[PDB]
Amino acid sequence: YGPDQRAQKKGDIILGGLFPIHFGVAAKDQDLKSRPESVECIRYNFRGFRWLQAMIFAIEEINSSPALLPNLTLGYRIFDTCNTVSKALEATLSFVAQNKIDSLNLDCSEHIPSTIAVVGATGSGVSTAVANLLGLFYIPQVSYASSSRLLSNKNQFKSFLRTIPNDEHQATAMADIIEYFRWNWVGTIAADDDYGRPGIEKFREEAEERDICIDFSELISQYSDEEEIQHVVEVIQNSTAKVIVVFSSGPDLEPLIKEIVRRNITGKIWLASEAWASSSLIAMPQYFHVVGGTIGFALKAGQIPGFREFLKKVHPRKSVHNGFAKEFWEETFNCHLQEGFRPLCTGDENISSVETPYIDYTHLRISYNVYLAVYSIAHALQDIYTCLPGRGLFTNGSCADIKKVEAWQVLKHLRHLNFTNNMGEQVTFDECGDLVGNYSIINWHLSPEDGSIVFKEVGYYNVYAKKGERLFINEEKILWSGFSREVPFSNCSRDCLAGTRKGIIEGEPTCCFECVECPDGEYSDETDASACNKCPDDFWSNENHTSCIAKEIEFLSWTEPFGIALTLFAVLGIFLTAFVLGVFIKFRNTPIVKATNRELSYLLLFSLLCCFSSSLFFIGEPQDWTCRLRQPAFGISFVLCISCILVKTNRVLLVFLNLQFLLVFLCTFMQIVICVIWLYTAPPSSYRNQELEDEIIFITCHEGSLMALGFLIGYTCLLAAICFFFAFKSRKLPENFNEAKFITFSMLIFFIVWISFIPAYASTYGKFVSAVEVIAILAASFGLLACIFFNKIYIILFKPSRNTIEEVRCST
Amino acid sequence: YGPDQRAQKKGDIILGGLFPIHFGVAAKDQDLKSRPESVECIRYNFRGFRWLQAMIFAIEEINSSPALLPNLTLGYRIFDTCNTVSKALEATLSFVAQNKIDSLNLDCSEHIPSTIAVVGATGSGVSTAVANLLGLFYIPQVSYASSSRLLSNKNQFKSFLRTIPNDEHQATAMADIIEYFRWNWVGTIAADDDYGRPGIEKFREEAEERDICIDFSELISQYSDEEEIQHVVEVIQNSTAKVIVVFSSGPDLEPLIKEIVRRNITGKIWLASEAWASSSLIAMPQYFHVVGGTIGFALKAGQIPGFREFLKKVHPRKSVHNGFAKEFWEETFNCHLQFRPLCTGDENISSVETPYIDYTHLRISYNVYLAVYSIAHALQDIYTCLPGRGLFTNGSCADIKKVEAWQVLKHLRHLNFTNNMGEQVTFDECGDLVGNYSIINWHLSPEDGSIVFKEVGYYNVYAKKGERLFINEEKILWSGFSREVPFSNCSRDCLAGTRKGIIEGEPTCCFECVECPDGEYSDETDASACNKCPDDFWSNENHTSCIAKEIEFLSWTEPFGIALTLFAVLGIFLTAFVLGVFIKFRNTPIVKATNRELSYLLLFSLLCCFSSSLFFIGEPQDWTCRLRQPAFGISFVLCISCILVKTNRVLLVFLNLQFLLVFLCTFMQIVICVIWLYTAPPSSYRNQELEDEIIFITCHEGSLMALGFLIGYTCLLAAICFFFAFKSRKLPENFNEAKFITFSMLIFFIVWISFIPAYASTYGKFVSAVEVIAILAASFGLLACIFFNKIYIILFKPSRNTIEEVRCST
Ligand SMILES: CC(C)(Cc1ccc2ccccc2c1)NC[C@@H](O)COc1cccc(Cl)c1C#N
Ligand SMILES: CC(C)(Cc1ccc2ccccc2c1)NC[C@@H](O)COc1cccc(Cl)c1C#N
Ligand SMILES: *[C@@H]1O[C@H](CO)[C@@H](O[C@@H]2O[C@H](CO)[C@@H](O)[C@H](O)[C@H]2NC(C)=O)[C@H](O)[C@H]1NC(C)=O
Ligand SMILES: N[C@@H](Cc1c[nH]c2ccccc12)C(=O)O
Ligand SMILES: N[C@@H](Cc1c[nH]c2ccccc12)C(=O)O
Ligand SMILES: *[C@@H]1O[C@H](CO)[C@@H](O)[C@H](O)[C@H]1NC(C)=O
Ligand SMILES: *[C@@H]1O[C@H](CO)[C@@H](O)[C@H](O)[C@H]1NC(C)=O
Ligand SMILES: *[C@@H]1O[C@H](CO)[C@@H](O)[C@H](O)[C@H]1NC(C)=O
Ligand SMILES: *[C@@H]1O[C@H](CO)[C@@H](O)[C@H](O)[C@H]1NC(C)=O
Ligand SMILES: *[C@@H]1O[C@H](CO)[C@@H](O)[C@H](O)[C@H]1NC(C)=O
Ligand SMILES: *[C@@H]1O[C@H](CO)[C@@H](O)[C@H](O)[C@H]1NC(C)=O
Ligand SMILES: *[C@@H]1O[C@H](CO)[C@@H](O)[C@H](O)[C@H]1NC(C)=O
Ligand SMILES: *[C@@H]1O[C@H](CO)[C@@H](O)[C@H](O)[C@H]1NC(C)=O
Ligand SMILES: *[C@@H]1O[C@H](CO)[C@@H](O)[C@H](O)[C@H]1NC(C)=O
Ligand SMILES: [Ca+2]
Ligand SMILES: [Ca+2]
Ligand SMILES: [Ca+2]
Ligand SMILES: [Ca+2]
């Protein structure tokens, strides 16, 4: 009536199931020279047998309780799929044998039992192929471990339900894990089925959202040959990425793991999915120098309060409704049962003496899914049983009949299901028939007692919280590759420090770059800069281009000690001129003072008080008003002083008011008219220039027109030359204590100071070019004050005042 | 047993058939006392009807010929799938009904026929679901239009064969088309099934190798609701990529196309796969402002001779074995068979424009023809087997009257036949067939206003990589117009003055051009690193290419240097005239009155003084700048020391002593010029620090103390002579010589004082222009004062009486 090896028991209501008792089929090649024969399944799976026992224990538990489904019993027909689509299709063609006869009008035993619900398959290709056929007859299929997203399409899979979350949240969780430890450079490996490809595509979308670069991406399989495995290992070994993300199962990853262990490749960081993070085919001590320190996902554990004793009650003779117990007994103890080199089995053997994954578990993660997968169908049937007329889920509020139940009525009550389990948590299904739950994050260690691999919990993924606040990882429990508390470095290129930029594009992806220094006018202080940023105006870049600092303004100042030293030599001149004026005003109507002109000497001593005070326009910060008055002050004061010297000597002044006060006004007026035309045609101005150096701003003054500056100096030098020539011709003539000799000396000192000044102006730098124009004024101003006046002051004031000051003297 | 309407004919060997007579099914989802019923198909498909008629015509043509399978007949049973997996599984269960009883031991009618082979489905999900159920019983399945790569796995699909190539070459061809027209910013759209998804993953894998950046990737479906369509359209119209690559079919693309038409989105470039490049659902003229100008692939054509005449003979009452003809006659003429009027039987098939009779090429109908003939040649190879040469265990043949499905599968695995067009047909180890592609482009007809597909190229799968694609650019209208090739790059290419230089958290295809700073350049049209311009060169103005620098010095061939050279040669040629008059007119009282031998040592020092100015003209070198200053120093101290001991007033009374006072005064400067050059020598120096455009060649003088000593000693010896000669200006002796000595020593100081501003006021190339005139003025002033008045008296008219020993004494 189907497959030979089966577990079945009769009752009023039949359920079906499909479990992996073997890992696969025998690898043989069909040459088709003869009739094809049925294939054999090779490797025994003990986890699958425990999952099968979960169904039987749940069904018997419901059969023993009068709270759930009174006066009604359950049966089962359970087969083996061997992780192959063909054997699953052979079993599910037996599930639909009665339903298909009525649809094909084939009209032969007529005693075929009916299946109203199936606890579905493990893999996601097997489940799709089963659901394709079960959807024709609306038979519900409650899978416990199929987690592909493609089964959430309710246009194609009308009657599919599951008790496991799908793989969108796990891909997003791996993206959060990679983003958490600050990595960019990864690689991906997938199985070539319906479980690997959507997980890798969702992870690729999530990683491309968060700027994570993928180096290599490969597909592997259980039946891939040797050349493909060698090519994948060459792809892995040619890469600098340490972090590798795997969506695969155990049987699909075991060839690649064995090949990587054979070449002994150490130092990779494996990120595991739910299928192989707890797999005993890969969690072996022999491989721990390759796969140590693996970080992986797990489901949430469950409590079945009587299950281990039921596992221990197994026996190959007392299990008459289980056809799978005999081979479990043979593979567990390595012997042979006599059919009613391997020795003969006896019934007196102990389950606890052999370490197999049948009772070596510490948690229940998929067996709890099988437990709820039976209890959901049981509460759907109970919801059918307890209905009151007029309040059903049908047209007129009518109710289905518990004596005559059809599969689509159970499907309709499974679409509206809300029941509380043994822990007090509520179980419902979505509009896509899904169920949601948390994840655990575990890490592979090495036991110090027996050397096996221990899965220690390091964190959780809480699916109910807001986006960005879901992952929790404790870093103090992670051992990277079984040791090495340092977090490993797994991004492409090392970061550029301050004063550099990411700079050069290469043709590689964005994660790989270089480091280039900034120019000499800009600043950059950040890790991984893409450009260099310009300083604001009147700022210049700091050394190493980390920050930007201010700029220094250079001018002659009032408070620096050189300016303080130059102010006192211009104050001393004023208080020496105001002493000569004091002696001249107090000691008037005396022969020396009255012998020459008294009124011209007052106008000469006022012009000297203007010549000393005209040097203070060259000290300080230049502005507009102190550069439009800087040159006319010197010009007018010196032409007034030189005119008063020239017109006073009286030898060729009156013999060739007064006629001598009118030769001063014209000579100063011809300079005033120049200084008015200059300021009303082309005025001087200030300037803040930055062109000599990039770190010093100089404050200088533009003089405007140079012709009006040439006239200003040429007229003064012309008048001093006329005075020098007219005073040189009277040096021997003694009159007023040999005055023309001292006038000649003063006009010589004026030209000596000018000729000494004209080298020094064109050879100095800023803040020192306004330092020569003060000493050039404060040398001529004492040279025109000493020679004319100090000899007469000595005769008037000191001891020659007894006899030398008289009208008899100062005549020869 | 099975579906209601079918096309069925009895024979000795029965073949199956699965064709899409309809496009899809309706939507009904509720379970309120349903006992849910059969789903209805909606839209009629005439192209699928033509494919079904191709299979029927091939079977009838095989049965008419005595040269292929004699004394035997072929039958058929053909169903409809409506592009649905469930509707195909209902028929496939009817196909395997006899074999299924034996496996389950279900045991009854016994009249169930046995199907030998199935002509497979169109879609790549429907074919997978059929192949899963058909591989149990080893019934072969030959598909005419499924092209997914997932069907090439022979561990899972043990009995599946194809007559259409898979989609590796199509995705590689799309990558070659994109690389040919030089784009790097595209987008992708794929159908959400077993057709679109591996093809778009293969295209992504090929496009990462060729440096093509993808902007967006989205998935569509036939039964998508409204919100997904609005989201996909909003993804499309935020992108700057004009090139969109679609890998889907007609019914899955139609809702998105309708939504893009209603929002009037224009300007995009569509790249079509084989499925919708000839689809009439998308190629409506009302959509031409959106999808006009599409570039797509197409298969290779075929020839079936009497096929149109077979198509023109369909009739609802003369087709007794084809139960699909009644709905065809209703849908073609919009009438009703016994508000739609009542049909008569006499309507004309050529009066209605449908895709049934208007095709102009056969592509998939030839695939159905080749499928049926492949099965027939496998049966003929079974039939003509010689005993002892079989393909079975002991070399034994099969039996044609008791044939089974696995025997036909074994023979189809070893099939090699020739078709009506003269080629060879065989399947490889994955049951795959290899073929070329044609590349077509959508135009608008100027007569009917419809859409015309014009061949612009071919893709050749038998050539070496990089030599497969052929495209004729002269035949492409890029949107129904616009012969210019469009632009799809993320950023425009940089120029030679700039560099490709930013990173934004954006893909490598997107950048911006940063201009090179003053001093750098590039010289390529896409440069990832701006280059520093080489040494002694500088950027021009736009940093697109840089030019050399200008070296600044006073030169021999510039006219100013020529003028200085002439003014220095005139002094030598005037000194050699005074020396000629002094040598010819010797033992005469003017020449003999002073020291004659000491006046020959002064006209040599003047010849050295004029020639010492030629070290300041030209390019500075190491030897010129090491002899530039000592030559001036020794020549001027010799020329001043020969004047100092010549006046004779305080020289011999305060060739015995004059030469021994010349020698010490020149030796005291020779020792300085030896210590300076053997302790701290001067050197040449090229400097670029003043300006970035001009290099200056100047000279470092080394120590400044040994430079100050020369000038100080020279001015000291010129001041002592001035003081000693000023005190004798009135004394008349040898024609008032001390007055002229005073004038010469005054002119020397005037030239020095005039020189000292101009050295510190000039720039480069003019600072060596003042040091020549300052030497050529002192050298003329130390000659004109001394050696002209005497020459005038000796040579010209005062030679009669003034030159005598009675004169030149007072
Ligand atoms: C104040 C002053 C007029 C300089 C000055 C000072 C004191 C002096 C004492 C006696 C006599 C002339 C004197 C000139 N400001 C002008 C300055 O900007 C620029 O000056 C020059 C710059 C170049 C060449 C010459 Cl030829 C001069 C002068 N001259
Ligand atoms: C050739 C020379 C010695 C300049 C020279 C030329 C002709 C001259 C004629 C008469 C007398 C002295 C003369 C000096 N090269 C020196 C030059 O580099 C630098 O010179 C100076 C630079 C700054 C200050 C002074 Cl004080 C001098 C001089 N001096
Ligand atoms: C768009 O970008 C592509 C590549 O990103 C540019 O194609 C390059 O053009 C230069 C100039 O002849 C060639 O040297 C390169 O070999 C081309 N690249 C490739 C990959 O072939 C194309 O020119 C750009 N189009 C623009 C800027 O209009
Ligand atoms: N859900 C996985 C299968 C799976 C989950 N947990 C497992 C444990 C063991 C083996 C397989 C599994 C899939 O879709 O393919
Ligand atoms: N190649 C398509 C099938 C196909 C080819 N041409 C078509 C024309 C119309 C519809 C479907 C098709 C597939 O694999 O799915
Ligand atoms: C790359 O690695 C560095 C450590 O070298 C780390 O600080 C950084 O966050 C990583 N990720 C980036 C740049 O995205
Ligand atoms: C890996 O690198 C080696 C270099 O020795 C090369 O030969 C090989 O083809 C590479 N494999 C890849 C890129 O898959
Ligand atoms: C393999 O790699 C491990 C890692 O350190 C090393 O200890 C060992 O020596 C290597 N070789 C073998 C043969 O195990
Ligand atoms: C299930 O029932 C509980 C209690 O009646 C209710 O609080 C909860 O919202 C229900 N769940 C759903 C999905 O309706
Ligand atoms: C998931 O985890 C969070 C916090 O760890 C917890 O509050 C929540 O109850 C968990 N979910 C379930 C269904 O227990
Ligand atoms: C597209 O543009 C709209 C309008 O600005 C914007 O709201 C949306 O976020 C953009 N992106 C996508 C993916 O739709
Ligand atoms: C669509 O837009 C184009 C220009 O963008 C315009 O010519 C055309 O008429 C539009 N079609 C409509 C509004 O139907
Ligand atoms: C198929 O038949 C042709 C015709 O003789 C022959 O040339 C060819 O070698 C055969 N085999 C293959 C694999 O094409
Ligand atoms: C395929 O394309 C090439 C290029 O034109 C051509 O030579 C060849 O004949 C075509 N057909 C076949 C069957 O190879
Ligand atoms: Ca009970
Ligand atoms: Ca690359
Ligand atoms: Ca025949
Ligand atoms: Ca991005």
Distance, first to last CA of chain A: 165 Å
> At CATH's second level, what is the architecture of the largest domain in chain A?
3-Layer(aba) Sandwich
Structural class of chain A: alpha/beta
Domain count of chain A: the total is 4
CATH class of the largest domain in chain A: Alpha Beta
Characterize the overall form of chain A.
Answer: rod-shaped
Strand residues, percent of chain A: 5-15%
CATH fold descriptor of the largest domain in chain A: Rossmann fold
Helix-residue proportion of chain A: 25-40%
Major sheet strand order of chain A: 8-7-9-10-11-14-15-16
CATH superfamily of the largest domain in chain A: Response regulator
Got a strand count of chain A?
Answer: 25
Q: If interface size is counted as residues with C-beta under 8 Å from the partner's C-beta, which chains form the largest one?
A: A-B, 64 and 64 residues
